[PDB]
RNA sequence: UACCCGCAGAAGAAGCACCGGCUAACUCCGUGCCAGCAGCCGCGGUAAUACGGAGGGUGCAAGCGUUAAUCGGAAUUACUG
C-alpha cells in the first residue's frame, strides 16, 4: 500500500524531477537523471501512442504517491464531477491532505507530509486527522498539533519550502505552523508539464 | 592423467561401504550351521560371498598402488623412475580389468548375439542409414577380434538395405551390443534431396543373444527359412552356400528369438503384477553425436561410424547395469 | 515392440525451413 | 467496546504476474524441433530478448495470477445500426 523502494529511480524513468527528495541538493548530483534505470538505461526506445499516455499516469501517480485503485477512483469521481475533468481529477490530487501539507512546508517531501499526518500530527479544523487520502475543503486550517512543533524536522521542511515556490490557493504561518486551505486550485496554478488530457485518455481506453 | 587414474580408483572406494557391512553380515547370520540347515539360506550367503570376494582381491591394486605411487613418481619420470611410472600402467591395467568386470557377469552376457537392423522412415535415405549402422557394427566386430556370419542381407530398390540380421559368435559379445539395441539417428543433409536440407532418418537395432516339429515349415526359394508358425516369427538365412549349415544356422536364430519373446514377456508380466526417444544420434553436419541416454558426446563422428567406439559402449553398459 | 515403435510418429522424417533458401519467405520476422 | 492518554524501539509486517508482436518492460548463461512454451500469430533443428535459470526491468500490490461465467469491443442478427 505505500512504494517504499528507490525513489530518484522513478523520477529516471519519467525523464523529469519528480521531487521525490526534499530539494536540498540538486538531483542531477545525487544520480544519472537523463539516463533511465537499469541494465539497458542509455538506449532510448521510441515509445508507443499507449505508453506514452501511461507513462504521464505513472508520472502524476508518482508525484503524489497513490496507488492505482485510489487514483482510478478519483478519476472516477472526476468525471461524475462537473466541467473539465482532468482539472478536476489535479484538484481531487491536491485536495489530499498529505499534499496540502507539503504544500505548506511541513513536510520536505510528500513522503514526509504523509509520515506526519499518520503519526498523528496534523490538525484540520482542531481535530487530528490521521488519513493521508482525506480531502481538505475550502477555508479549512490546517496546523502542526502542539506536540509536533518541536520537530526540527518541520521546520527544516518549512525552510526548504521558503526557498521553493509558494502555492496561491493557500496562506501559510511560519510561527504558528498553521495554513488555510482558501480555495481549491485552478489549473494554470499547479505545473503545465503534465498533461491531465493524456491520463483521461488512458481512462477511456 | 594423474587426475583421471583419481577418478576411476574412486570408483573402486565407492564400492567399500558394500563389501564390509555386508561381508558382516553374512559372517554373522549366514555363515552359521543353525542357519545353513536350510540350503535356500545357504545359497544365498554364497551369493553374498561372492560379493566379498570380488571386493578383496581387486581393492589392493587400487590401495596398494596408489600409496606407494607418490614417494617415487613426484618430481623424476624419465631417468631412474622410468619403470616406476609404468610401474603404475599396471594399475591402470588391474582398474580397467575391475570396471569391466563390474560391467559385465550380468545373465546372457557371454552367449554371442544377433543383432538385426531395422530401417525407419525416409525410405531411401533411411535404408543407406541402414547400411551405415551395419557396416559400422561389421567394424566393431572386426576391431574387437569377432567373426561376423551375415545371415540376412536385403536391398532396398531405390538405393541402401531394407533388412538385415547380422550374428556375430566370440568372447562377451552379447554384452557390448546388448545396449545399442534401439533407435539411432541420423541427422544429415540428404545426398538424395537436391535441396540438401538437413533429414532425419532412423533405425531400429533389435539386438538379441542367441541361447515344434509339425507346427514349423521348412522352404527352399538353396535358401532356407524356419517358419515356427506357433509364435508367428520367421527367420530366413543366405550365409552359406552348403543347405544343411544354412538350416542349422536359421534353427539357432528362430531358438534365440522364441526365449527372448519368452522372457520379456514375462518381465512385463511381473512388472505388471508388481528409453522413449532415439537412444543415440549421430549429427553429420555438425560433426557430432550425442548418445541422449547417458550424456556422452563424440566429436569424430567418421571414428565413431567406421569403428564402433567401445568408450561409448562400455558407458552404456555401466548404466545398464546401474538400472539392473 | 522394436518394430512397432520405428513405426510410430515420433520417429517421422523431419525437414526444416530455410532462411535464404527456396521456401524461404518470412512475412513477419520472429522480432519486430 | 468505539475513542483518548502513556510506554518502549525501525522495531513485528512484500508478494504475484509479466518483459517476441498485440502489450508497459532486455540482456547473459543452459538447451538444442528435444525438454518445454502458447490467448491469437506462432517460438525451439547449437549465437533462443518467445523454453528453463539468472541479473536487470515493467505492472499490480496485501494481494497477484490461472480457470469458469456474462456484457463489451462485435456495426459479427445491424430498432438506433
Ligand atoms: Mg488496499
Ligand atoms: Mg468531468
Ligand atoms: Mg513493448
Ligand atoms: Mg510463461
Ligand atoms: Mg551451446
Ligand atoms: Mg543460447
Ligand atoms: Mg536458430
Ligand atoms: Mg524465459
Ligand atoms: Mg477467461
Ligand atoms: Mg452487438
Ligand atoms: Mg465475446
Known amino acids: ?205 | 592423467n594423474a587426475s583421471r587414474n583419481a577418478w576411476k580408483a574412486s570408483g573402486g572406494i565407492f564400492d567399500i561401504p558394500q563389501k564390509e557391512t555386508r561381508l558382516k553380515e553374512l559372517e554373522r547370520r549366514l555363515e552359521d550351521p543353525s542357519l545353513w540347515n536350510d540350503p535356500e539360506a545357504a545359497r544365498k550367503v554364497s551369493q553374498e560371498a561372492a560379493r566379498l570376494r570380488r571386493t578383496v582381491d581387486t581393492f589392493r591394486s587400487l590401495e596398494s598402488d596408489l600409496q606407494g605411487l607418490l614417494e617415487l613418481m613426484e618430481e623424476l619420470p624419465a631417468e631412474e623412475r622410468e619403470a616406476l611410472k609404468p610401474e603404475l600402467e599396471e594399475a591402470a591395467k588391474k582398474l580397467d580389468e575391475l570396471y569391466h568386470q563390474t560391467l559385465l557377469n550380468f545373465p546372457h552376457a557371454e552367449k554371442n548375439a544377433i543383432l538385426t537392423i531395422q530401417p525407419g522412415a525416409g525410405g531411401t535415405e533411411a535404408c543407406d542409414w541402414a547400411e551405415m549402422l551395419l557396416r559400422m557394427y561389421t567394424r566393431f566386430a572386426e576391431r574387437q577380434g569377432f567373426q561376423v556370419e551375415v545371415v540376412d542381407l536385403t536391398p532396398g530398390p531405390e538405393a541402401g538395405i531394407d533388412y538385415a540380421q547380422i550374428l556375430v559368435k566370440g568372447e562377451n559379445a552379447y554384452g557390448l551390443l546388448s545396449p545399442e539395441a534401439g533407435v539411432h539417428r541420423l541427422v544429415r543433409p540428404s545426398p538424395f534431396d537436391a535441396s540438401g536440407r538437413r533429414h532425419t532418418s532412423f533405425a531400429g537395432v533389435e539386438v538379441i543373444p542367441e541361447v515344434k516339429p509339425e507346427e514349423l515349415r521348412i522352404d527352399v526359394m538353396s535358401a532356407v527359412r524356419v517358419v515356427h508358425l506357433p509364435t508367428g516369427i520367421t527367420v530366413t538365412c543366405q550365409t552359406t552356400r552348403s543347405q544343411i549349415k544354412n538350416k542349422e544356422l536359421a534353427l539357432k536364430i528362430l531358438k534365440a528369438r522364441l526365449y527372448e519373446l519368452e522372457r520379456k514377456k514375462r518381465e512385463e508380466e511381473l512388472k505388471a503384477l508388481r528409453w522413449g526417444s532415439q537412444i543415440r544420434s549421430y549429427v553429420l553436419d555438425k560433426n557430432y553425436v550425442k548418445d541422449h541416454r547417458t550424456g556422452l558426446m563424440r566429436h569424430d563422428p567418421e571414428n565413431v561410424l567406421d569403428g564402433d567406439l567401445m568408450d561409448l559402449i562400455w558407458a552404456g553398459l555401466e548404466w545398464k547395469a546401474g538400472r539392473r | 515392440a522394436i518394430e512397432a515403435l520405428l513405426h510410430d510418429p515420433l520417429f517421422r522424417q523431419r525437414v526444416e525451413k530455410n532462411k535464404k533458401g527456396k521456401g524461404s519467405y518470412m512475412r513477419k520476422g520472429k522480432h519486430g
Not at chain 1, 12 to 29: H, M, P, Q, Y
Not at chain 1, 99 to 108: D, K, L, P, S
Not at chain 1, 126 to 151: C, F, H, L, M, T
Request: with cysteine.
Open chain 1, 1 to 205: 500500500a505505500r512504494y517504499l523502494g528507490p525513489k530518484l529511480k522513478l523520477s529516471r524513468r519519467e525523464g523529469t524531477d519528480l521531487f521525490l527528495k526534499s530539494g536540498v541538493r540538486a538531483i542531477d548530483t545525487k544520480c544519472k537523471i537523463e539516463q533511465a534505470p537499469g541494465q539497458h538505461g542509455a538506449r532510448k526506445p521510441r515509445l508507443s501512442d499507449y505508453g506514452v499516455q501511461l507513462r504521464e499516469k505513472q508520472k502524476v501517480r508518482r508525484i503524489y504517491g497513490v496507488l492505482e485503485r485510489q487514483f482510478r477512483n478519483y478519476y472516477k469521481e472526476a468525471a461524475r464531477l462537473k466541467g473539465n475533468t482532468g482539472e478536476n481529477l489535479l484538484a481531487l490530487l491536491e485536495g489530499r491532505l498529505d499534499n496540502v501539507v507539503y504544500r505548506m512546508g511541513f513536510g520536505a517531501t510528500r513522503a514526509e507530509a504523509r509520515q506526519l499526518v499518520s503519526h498523528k500530527a496534523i490538525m484540520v479544523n482542531g481535530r487530528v486527522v490521521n488519513i493521508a487520502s482525506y480531502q481538505v475543503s475550502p477555508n479549512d486550517v490546517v496546523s502542526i498539533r502542539e506536540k509536533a512543533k518541536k520537530q526540527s524536522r518541520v521546520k527544516a521542511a518549512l525552510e526548504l519550502a521558503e526557498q521553493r515556490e509558494k502555492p496561491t490557493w493557500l496562506e501559510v504561518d511560519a510561527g504558528k505552523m498553521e495554513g488555510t486551505f482558501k480555495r481549491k486550485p485552478e489549473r494554470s496554478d499547479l505545473s503545465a508539464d503534465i498533461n491531465e488530457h493524456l491520463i483521461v485518455e488512458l481512462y477511456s481506453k
